[PDB]
Design a binder for this molecule. Structure first.
Ligand SMILES: Cc1cc2nc3c(=O)[nH]c(=O)nc-3n(C[C@H](O)[C@H](O)[C@H](O)COP(=O)(O)OP(=O)(O)OC[C@H]3O[C@@H](n4cnc5c(N)ncnc54)[C@H](O)[C@@H]3O)c2cc1C
Ligand SMILES: NCCc1ccc(O)c(O)c1
Length: 433
């Protein structure tokens, strides 16, 4: 009676929540698998996360699922103390990881600089624009101005030198999963607000703890709780919200309400009748700022490596992640432009490593191009200029659920999908009561 489109974390958790409340549901999943943009799979000799990877106990929704499905102790920190390399003026600079972090810490201090006035409650991101806002006019003006400013311009304008600029440029190529110069700096400021405004905490939350048993231990857990079979290989083609849903084969399914978790980068596969609001339609057409890609590279030997490179490098942040039995290292990498790298080309993977070193030898590589993926069309959702205040909040019988619309760790984190999936089901629940 309630139709959930997509079996990623938002869809699975919404179904479990409806089930709790005794409401009939059905999940229609385009792919032949569950997990969506979280995808644990054996590649290159071990389970690797092709999408979502890191977790933290300060992420409320993720951490309760970690507790629920038995992974409390089953988390491991990514290697630290790497030999660090960063490109800053056509040149490769060699340092320690702590050397890099302290440069990034001071720049982050400036980047967060008004989060305390914007986000007293870091989970009320649009409070400044609320009728309830009790602050001065000049804070609302700085807020809107920040939505139209990118995060690197904030560091440039504070007088930092070119070294620190290319470091933040590389950082946000990875963080904004695409071109950071088109991004909204209010995203970065809210990550600060959710991280006690400390670079170190922000990295502990987003870039440290991995699930020993992968994301699949969680989404297999949620799916294992459901008493209604997920209909895989059932891509949705049309949605009528007056609700009626039409699959690609032409099957028609009737429903009291529709919870659509299809990411924006993939909504163009579905026709809506009536059409979507013009405001929301312009977001879909502009979509999100996530055009980048994530790679897994394997090299010869055991090397503790960290590398940073600004736009337009193939990869902006690359880091050792696993030391393997056969004297190899698996590194992870994040880059701003999915179309500048073939994630499964040993030669393109070598050119990534060649950004910093001419003595490290790639022997394998792999990745999934989420942006080119029909059912995704993006990496993790990040914000263009103007999308903090006129973007993710515009998607509020038809409900949109997904990390990209979350109040808290929006887009970038499974925490956001688990948040928004659950609260969107509550909207359904509340209105049926
Ligand atoms: C490279 C990468 C790395 C990430 N790393 C992390 C990390 O370390 N930590 C973290 O917390 N988060 C991370 N994330 C983010 C996390 O994966 C997402 O925020 C979360 O999985 C989004 O869940 P969702 O349910 O909102 O969307 P999705 O996972 O995209 O779920 C949508 C589902 O709908 C399906 N679908 C699409 N179109 C249709 C259609 N027409 N009909 C039917 N079904 C359809 C899709 O197949 C998919 O199963 C990462 C994301 C990426 C891309
Ligand atoms: N994949 C985790 C998302 C992410 C990307 C870049 C960062 O700089 C960061 O702190 C977190």
């Amino acid at each position: 009676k309630v139709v959930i489109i997509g079996a990623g974390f938002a869809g699975l958790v919404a179904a479990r929540e409806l089930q709790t409340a005794g409401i009939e549901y059905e999940i229609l999943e385009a792919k032949d698998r569950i997990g969506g943009r979280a995808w644990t799979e054996e590649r290159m000799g071990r389970p690797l996360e092709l999408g979502a990877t890191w977790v933290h106990w300060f992420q409320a929704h993720t951490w309760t699922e970690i507790m629920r499905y038995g992974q409390r102790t089953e988390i491991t920190a990514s290697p630290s103390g790497n030999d660090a390399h960063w490109v800053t003026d056509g040149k490769v600079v060699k340092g320690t990881e702590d050397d890099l972090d302290e440069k990034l810490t001071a720049a982050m201090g400036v980047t967060y600089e008004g989060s305390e006035e914007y986000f007293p409650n870091p989970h009320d991101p649009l409070w400044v624009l609320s009728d309830d806002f009790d602050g001065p006019a000049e804070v609302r003006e700085r807020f809107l101005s920040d939505d139209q400013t990118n995060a690197i311009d904030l560091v440039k304008e504070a007088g930092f030198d070119q070294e620190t600029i290319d470091l933040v440029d590389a950082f946000w190529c990875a963080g904004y999963i695409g071109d950071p110069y088109t991004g909204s700096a209010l995203m970065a400021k809210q990550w600060g607000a959710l991280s006690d405004n400390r670079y170190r905490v922000m990295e502990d939350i987003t870039l440290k703890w991995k699930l020993n048993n992968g994301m699949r231990s969680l989404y297999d857990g949620i799916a294992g709780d459901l008493n209604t079979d997920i209909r895989l290989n059932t891509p949705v083609a049309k949605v009528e919200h007056h609700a009626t849903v039409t699959t690609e084969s032409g099957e028609v399914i009737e429903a009291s309400a529709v919870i659509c978790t299809v990411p924006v980068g993939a909504l163009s596969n579905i026709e809506f009748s009536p059409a979507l609001p013009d405001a929301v339609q312009s977001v879909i057409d502009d979509k999100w700022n996530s055009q980048g890609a994530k790679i897994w590279i394997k090299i010869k030997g055991h090397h503790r490596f960290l590398g940073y490179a600004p736009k337009p490098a193939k990869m902006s942040v690359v880091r050792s992640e696993y030391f393997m039995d056969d004297d190899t290292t698996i590194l992870v990498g994040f880059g701003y432009d999915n179309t500048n790298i073939d994630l499964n080309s040993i030669e393109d993977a070598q050119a990534v490593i060649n950004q910093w070193r001419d003595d490290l030898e790639v022997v394998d590589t792999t990745g999934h191009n989420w942006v080119a993926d029909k059912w995704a069309g993006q990496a993790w959702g990040t914000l263009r200029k103007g999308q903090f205040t006129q973007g993710w909040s515009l998607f509020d019988q038809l409900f949109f659920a997904g990390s990209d619309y979350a109040y808290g760790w929006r887009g970038v984190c499974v925490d956001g999908a688990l948040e928004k999936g659950m609260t969107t089901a509550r909207q359904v629940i509340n209105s049926m009561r």
